Structure formats: structure tokens, C-alpha cells
Design a protein around this nucleic acid. Structure first.
Length: 52
DNA sequence: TTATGTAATACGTCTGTAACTTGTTCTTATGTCTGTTATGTAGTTAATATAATTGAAGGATTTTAAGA
């Protein structure tokens, strides 16, 4: 009874939901990027990995 | 009578046994460390697919809460 009250989706529904998910994801990522210590962490991680 | 010399006898006693004890020396059982292999855990896969499930059955009486 509980799960039958949700309508079934189509292709375009999946596309729209995926677009909403990525929109939220990149909002979160942009929020993280605006932080003075975030970029140095990625930079030092790249510095370590590039040294193999 | 009395010196003398043998003889019984009791007590030290020199030595042979044995107990107490330690050195030390060798052997072995055990605990531990380390290296290798098997076991146990975990993450991922992209035609599409979109309301179970399986039974089960001749019961006969009481008492006690919900519904009206």
C-alpha cells in the first residue's frame, strides 16, 4: 500500500531527477571551493600523487 | 706377704658406612619470534526487466470484551 502510491517514471523523469542530483552536487562543490583551506588540500594531494 | 703375670672387662677410638648437601654440567621441554600460505572480507558489474504466497480444512463447549 505504501509503495503503490508513488507513480512510475519514464525516461525523461530519470533525466530530470539526475539533473537535479548533479545540480545539488555541484552546489555543494561550489560551496566547498569557497574556503581558503580547501584548495591547498587538493594542491598538496596532487603534489604527493604526482611524485608517484 | 707381696711382686708378678695372666685374664676378664669396660671404655675410648680409628676407621668404614652412610646421610646431608652443594657444584656444575649436560640435556630437554617450552615459549617466543619470524616467514609464508591460506582464509576471510569487500567492491563492482550499464540491452530491460517495476503490488507474494502457500496452504487448509467433520470441534465442542464455555467465558468475556467490542460493535450495534
Amino acid at each position: 500500500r505504501e509503495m503503490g502510491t508513488v507513480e512510475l517514471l519514464t525516461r525523461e523523469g530519470e533525466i530530470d531527477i539526475a539533473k537535479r542530483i548533479e545540480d545539488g552536487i555541484n552546489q555543494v562543490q561550489s560551496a566547498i571551493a569557497e574556503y581558503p583551506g580547501t584548495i591547498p588540500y587538493i594542491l598538496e594531494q596532487f603534489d604527493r600523487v604526482q611524485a608517484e
